Amino acid sequence: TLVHVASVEKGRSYEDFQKVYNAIALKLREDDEYDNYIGYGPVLVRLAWHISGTWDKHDNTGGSYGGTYRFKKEFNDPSNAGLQNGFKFLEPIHKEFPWISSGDLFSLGGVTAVQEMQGPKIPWRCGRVDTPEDTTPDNGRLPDADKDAGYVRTFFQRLNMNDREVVALMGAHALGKTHLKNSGYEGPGGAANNVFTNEFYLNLLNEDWKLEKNDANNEQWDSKSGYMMLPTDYSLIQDPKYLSIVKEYANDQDKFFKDFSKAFEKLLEDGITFPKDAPSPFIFKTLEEQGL
Numbered sequence: 077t078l079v080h081v082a083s084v085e086k087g088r089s090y091e092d093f094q095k096v097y098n099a100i101a102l103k104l105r106e107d108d109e110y111d112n113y114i115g116y117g118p119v120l121v122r123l124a125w126h127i128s129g130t131w132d133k134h135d136n137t138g139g140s141y142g143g144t145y146r147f148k149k150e151f152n153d154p155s156n157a158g159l160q161n162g163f164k165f166l167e168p169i170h171k172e173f174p175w176i177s178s179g180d181l182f183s184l185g186g187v188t189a190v191q192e193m194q195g196p197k198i199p200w201r202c203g204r205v206d207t208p209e210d211t212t213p214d215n216g217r218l219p220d221a222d223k224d225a226g227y228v229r230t231f232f233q234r235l236n237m238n239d240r241e242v243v244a245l246m247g248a249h250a251l252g253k254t255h256l257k258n259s260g261y262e263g264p265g266g267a268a269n270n271v272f273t274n275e276f277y278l279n280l281l282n283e284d285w286k287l288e289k290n291d292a293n294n295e296q297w298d299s300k301s302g303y304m305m306l307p308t309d310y311s312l313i314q315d316p317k318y319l320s321i322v323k324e325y326a327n328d329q330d331k332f333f334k335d336f337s338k339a340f341e342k343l344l345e346d347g348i349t350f351p352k353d354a355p356s357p358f359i360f361k362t363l364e365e366q367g368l
């Protein structure tokens with residue numbers, strides 16, 4: 077097992093990272109046309125998850141620490157198709173703040189997107205350090221979408237996530253859309269595509285889902301409202317243990333926010349050793365809170 081010790085960018089503190097957060101948040105507001113006016117929030121959340129989701133608890137390979145998405149093997153992962161849009165969004169931010177590590181930037185993009193979309197506060201820690209190209213994990217560590225509840229449960233054990241953590245994390249599927257050209261799936265998960273709510277769970281329980289084939293010849297569950305669920309999403313109401321948790325989150329917005337915040341921070345920090353004297357996690361103010 078590799079050890080990755082968090083190392084604070086030299087001399088930086090909360091205020092420096094709040095400036096980076098603010099730059100990301102301002103660009104999120106500015107570049108509003110993207111993806112038929114969804115904006116960049118959802119793709120930034122997906123990027124933060126995919127750079128973290130390569131982690132393997134068994135040997136501490138992959139994970140957000142090394143910023144390895146910047147290397148061709150990882151950014152060309154078929155599982156990452158479309159994330160180049162998020163990377164391009166972050167490029168001017170990195171140019172303005174060249175001192176931030178790549179892993180810190182990609183993970184902070186996800187935190188900023190969740191909060192700016194009115195989601196929960198997500199505490200965030202700095203100190204990821206870029207590692208060399210040979211530390212890039214091979215393709216194939218991110219999950220397939222065509223599988224069942226047992227696949228999802230087993231998959232997430234590798235990321236040290238339990239049933240509650242898995243169901244909470246999947247609530248991010250309220251955001252954005254599937255794009256046929258990226259993933260072979262098409263459509264949004266609900267009405268509020270760029271506002272962070274518990275709608276994923278409500279839609280799973282309340283919509284009338286039909287199992288259909290899309291134009292890429294893949295199965296997905298579709299509702300007459302024009303929403304979709306991946307087979308892996310739908311598995312959360314097929315498995316009785318997942319179903320209980322889906323119902324809980326559909327009925328308690330605050331509980332979902334609190335559990336999502338914990339699981340998402342954990343996801344973004346998997347693989348990182350934080351020294352005992354490392355700074356406490358930062359909680360960034362939103363632009364709205366700052367009057368900006």
Ligand code: HEM
Nearest residue numbers: 118119121122125219220221245248252253254255258259
């Ligand atoms: C079983 C696990 C998962 C599977 C199989 C899966 C699969 C997918 C697929 C196929 C897409 C569509 C990509 C595209 O066509 O552009 C997508 C989108 C998305 N996923 Fe997941 N995902 C999983 C878990 C997660 C998790 C844990 C998160 C974050 C907490 C997440 C966040 C998102 C977001 C925000 C989008 C929308 C991206 C956009 O609008 O550009 N997903 N997911």
Ligand SMILES: C[C@@H]1C=C(N)NCC1
Nearest residue numbers: 249252253265304305
């Ligand atoms: C916006 C998309 C809706 C889902 N149900 N799953 C993937 C993300």
